[PDB]
Amino acid sequence: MYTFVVRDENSSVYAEVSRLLLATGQWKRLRKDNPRFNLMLGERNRLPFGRLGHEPGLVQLVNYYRGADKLCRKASLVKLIKTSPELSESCTWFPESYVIYPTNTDEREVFLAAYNRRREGREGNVWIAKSSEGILISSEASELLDFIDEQGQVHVIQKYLEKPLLLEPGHRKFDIRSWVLVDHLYNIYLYREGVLRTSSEPYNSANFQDKTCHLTNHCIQKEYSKNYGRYEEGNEMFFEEFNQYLMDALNTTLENSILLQIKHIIRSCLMCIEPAISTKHLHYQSFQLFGFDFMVDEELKVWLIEVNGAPACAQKLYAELCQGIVDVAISSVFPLATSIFIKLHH
Amino acid sequence: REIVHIQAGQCGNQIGAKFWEVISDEHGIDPTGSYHGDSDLQLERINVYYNEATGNKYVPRAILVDLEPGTMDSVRSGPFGQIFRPDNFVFGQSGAGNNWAKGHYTEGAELVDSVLDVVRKESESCDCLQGFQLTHSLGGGTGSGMGTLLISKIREEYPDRIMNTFSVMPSPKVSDTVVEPYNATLSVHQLVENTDETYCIDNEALYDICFRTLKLTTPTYGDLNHLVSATMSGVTTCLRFPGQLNADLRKLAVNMVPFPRLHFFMPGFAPLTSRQYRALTVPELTQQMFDSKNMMAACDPRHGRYLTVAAIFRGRMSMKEVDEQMLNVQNKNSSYFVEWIPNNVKTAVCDIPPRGLKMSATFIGNSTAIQELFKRISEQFTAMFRRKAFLHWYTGEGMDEMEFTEAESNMNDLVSEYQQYQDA
Amino acid sequence: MEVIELNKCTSGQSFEVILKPPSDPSLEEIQKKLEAAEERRKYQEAELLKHLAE
Amino acid sequence: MRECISIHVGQAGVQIGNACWELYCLEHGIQPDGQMPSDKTIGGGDDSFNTFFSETGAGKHVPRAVFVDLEPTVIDEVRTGTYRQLFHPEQLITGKEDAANNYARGHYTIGKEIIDLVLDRIRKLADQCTGLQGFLVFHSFGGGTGSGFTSLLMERLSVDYGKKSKLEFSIYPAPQVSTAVVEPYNSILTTHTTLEHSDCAFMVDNEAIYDICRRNLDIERPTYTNLNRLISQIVSSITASLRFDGALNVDLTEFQTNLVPYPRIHFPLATYAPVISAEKAYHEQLSVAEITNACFEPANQMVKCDPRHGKYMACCLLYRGDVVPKDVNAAIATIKTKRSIQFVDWCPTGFKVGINYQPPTVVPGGDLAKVQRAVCMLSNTTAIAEAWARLDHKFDLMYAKRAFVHWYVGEGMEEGEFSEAREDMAALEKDYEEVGV
């Protein structure tokens, strides 16, 4: 009989995982501070990795990779892509990005060298700015940096994707959320189901102060959008509909036009950091569920924008994905008495 | 290093004699004091309990005390009777009539100075005396009243030594007189203040063990005392045998007693034996030693939480298996071990098994469930005391009802202090 | 990656390898502490003996 | 030539000292009676081994060592054991009753009146020294003697020998072999009181030695004897440069210079490879690259932690056996490409390397196999602060209930010393965190 402890109550995915674990009759839950656990569903902040794997008679397993923040916080991920030979500054699937600190190392004096070549060459010169609410998409820099310095945290600003793929009917934008589980053996598992978080407002390439047709967040769309839910329930188009659409409208499959690229990006990122975070020879073991956020341009080219390290699922898919976490991440290590994941290897 | 042993009153001297028989056998010493064992593990720490005398003889560092000579004579006539030095028999003639007050205030006071003389003589022949262990019941008169008088005297003369007791608790299922609760409560008040560590040997538990599981229909005091001498040999094995852990009374106090007053230990033993052939496996030894049914204090350990635990495995077995099983107990029941004392369970291994067993395990728990014991006593106490019944036996020896009220309160405070840490 | 200060001898050698440049109380107070703790100890013992004398 | 005095305190310190000095005698060809035939300068000399051994007119080579315990049973085993003749009686000092696992009992009650005798015997050794450079102190964190008496001894050494270096070999407490429930209290207490009196400390977590013994020695349930022969290999690896010809870490001041830039952060991590069972029938001898690579596996560290999520301030490689510089530099190059090695910005990225061509000596009949080459890495990485986190956490759990505190207060210690020591450790943990994140 196995024991676990729950140190992040505000996690939908692992709330569900706790329930399924209990419902097996082979897992009992202990108090958040009882160190004699087999499993730790840890807190999102300052998880005590240094206290794991020092309990004799206990194989211990945690649901986070110490180190993985380097991939999952925006400035960090830019730094990692630019400096890592495996990805390099010549990376073809990440947009041009730069790390900018507020007025109160930095890259704005290297930014401007590229910005002005883009304005002179008479290219599209929209840039987006954000950190890890408070977003500015502009066409001239002195709006960007001016906004950055009103806030007080490190920011990244990056070449906005000016020619996205637009779903018809609607002429609207979207992003693709992929859910990837990495297990203690460092198998990379892409969940068969992705989601398209769409916008409900036709794409207005004119004024970039309206964020309703340029940012695809499930929140901003329920609250501040006109017709949230006109085309798909909850502004969420799943993979079968989207594949159908690509076949009907564009004469391709989702696998061919897009997924090949998403698998290549996922595998490349994770294999890049594998030496820094793998627990292959460690006294405790890690797994972790990641949410890779992708954007497809009008030429059917996939781009990575964020990796999130503590993602939520879509209500339809919680059951199946949480059961998959239990199967591959947890029962693999602690056995009980046709898989929904595609294994990424090359 | 050296321990001085005192046994007081009927029960104190009967269990004391059984203890000296049992560990004398374990250490290879015969009723004359002549060592006749084979191994040398038996002698490395033989001086903790024995004095070396002329002609390579071994004399227990044991003082025998009573207010009536009946039982002391019974010991002299008994099997090991002639191993004790005769000068260490200190007895009166009047008895104590199952009266704590006679033992503590009137008859006992008359005798206690000569006991303390013998105590002092034994202690000054000690290279480094670590302290004293006392055996006594709490429900009679000599053991409870005069043994606690002794203990506070001994503390006055030796305030920097360890005072340890084996204290048998009275049970109506095994009862001599109705005033036993009175006596016990007065004694517990004493013990809470003046011992460092007390083994609570419940006669209720010993009766239930003989009856429900040893299938003895009419348990005698002999049957109870066989269980007691097994427990005693077990809880003192790390004291008298050389091991990795070089243990003594003070380290045991330091490690077992997080707060001074909560020093009342629940002892346990496995396999439960009666006065067999199947060898126990280490998983079986470990499951039994933790079983409520193998403990000598009638309490439900699931009704409380373990502050500290010390466990002793006697026999030739796998130290690897012992470690795995102990860790498995803690990890599969961690609910019942306080989380604010990390790694509160420690284990020791001795190669020599007790007589007649290839393997055994002794358990020493400091559980908050021990409160159940005292609650029992307090209820019985109050049942009489509210009607002031049988008090005249005590006021006739000088005592005031106020003293009863004080001891009752102190015991109820002890119960509360245990309850404090059962919910922390 | 450059190798410097190579010293060597019949028993062995030593050297450095650079990969990249750089981007008490007195005896008095002590015996005072020891004696303070001995005073607290002697006082607790006196409290105990006075209680026993009561 | 400048002398080194070893001081062994409490059970762990004495048994580890036994192991180390047995090893030293094997390595320098000193027999159990103290005779070293290869020593042609009879009655004296200023050779390298003389920093650890003095010489008698009768050709006897005598450790510059003091053993001190508050109870007699363990040092009595030195007095009657194989190397009884090696040690002069007045270097073996015992009390009557131990510190009962109680830091305050060791520091205050029992310490107070064996301290002057110990310092007098230490002075009888120092007076035999033309130029003493300082002390190597062996002790557990967990014992009442090893914690409390050691910290008193360290304070006094700073007083009576203020210009001298003091090094620690410190056993960190592990439940699988620990003897007492209060070892976190003692650990924190003795670390706080010793921090400013120690120039460099090598911490050894019994949990790491225990696991190394099980995994690589195939010992079911390791004893102290197992652990100590392994620990003594590592200690010999660390001190070989004080006892042999060479140019790296030749005096005690050089350990501070090379390994401790910031004085408070003076706990270097030690990694040691290879550890091979004597019962391994067929063994393929590991290369320079394989053992240097093993120096970066956590499973070979003296303390389990993850240096990948920390930063380095220094790094020394001590080889013994068939090793030449170019093979070391090749190994390092490839290792740098495949591993997460981040130095602090204000420190060079680099390795000080020391090679002694005599391969490790192994105790006959021990558990460790002879090997053609072995390395000990000494790295000052912030990751070792994980150990302090663990220790501090255990402390905070007990102290929040003041569990067992009464045992210390009753020895004359004040409750405030507990929160003061803990205060200090909070400071230490923060120093580490902002040197390395």
Ligand SMILES: Nc1nc2c(ncn2[C@@H]2O[C@H](COP(=O)(O)OP(=O)(O)OP(=O)(O)O)[C@@H](O)[C@H]2O)c(=O)[nH]1
């Ligand atoms: N590695 C190793 N650890 C030891 C050894 N002996 C004891 N220890 C560890 O040291 C701690 C106990 O400290 P000890 O040195 O045994 O106690 P002490 O310093 O003698 O102090 P007291 O006995 O309290 O007077 C525990 O964590 C033990 O596991 C040993 O020989 N080798």
Ligand SMILES: Nc1nc2c(ncn2[C@@H]2O[C@H](COP(=O)(O)OP(=O)(O)O)[C@@H](O)[C@H]2O)c(=O)[nH]1
């Ligand atoms: N377990 C056990 N209890 C005993 C024994 N003899 C007496 N008792 C118990 O001790 C109490 C009687 O006290 P006792 O020792 O005879 O009186 P004392 O001589 O005045 O101290 C009662 O609770 C008895 O049940 C014995 O041999 N074994």
Ligand SMILES: COc1ccc(N(C)c2nc(Cl)nc3cccc(F)c23)cc1
């Ligand atoms: C944390 O709980 C602890 C409890 C006890 C102890 N020591 C001091 C022991 N002493 C004695 Cl006499 N018998 C023991 C028997 C078994 C285990 C022990 F550990 C014993 C150490 C720690």
Ligand SMILES: [Ca+2]
């Ligand atoms: Ca010489």
Ligand SMILES: [Cl-]
């Ligand atoms: Cl000096």
Ligand SMILES: [Mg+2]
């Ligand atoms: Mg009777």
Ligand SMILES: [Mg+2]
């Ligand atoms: Mg000791």
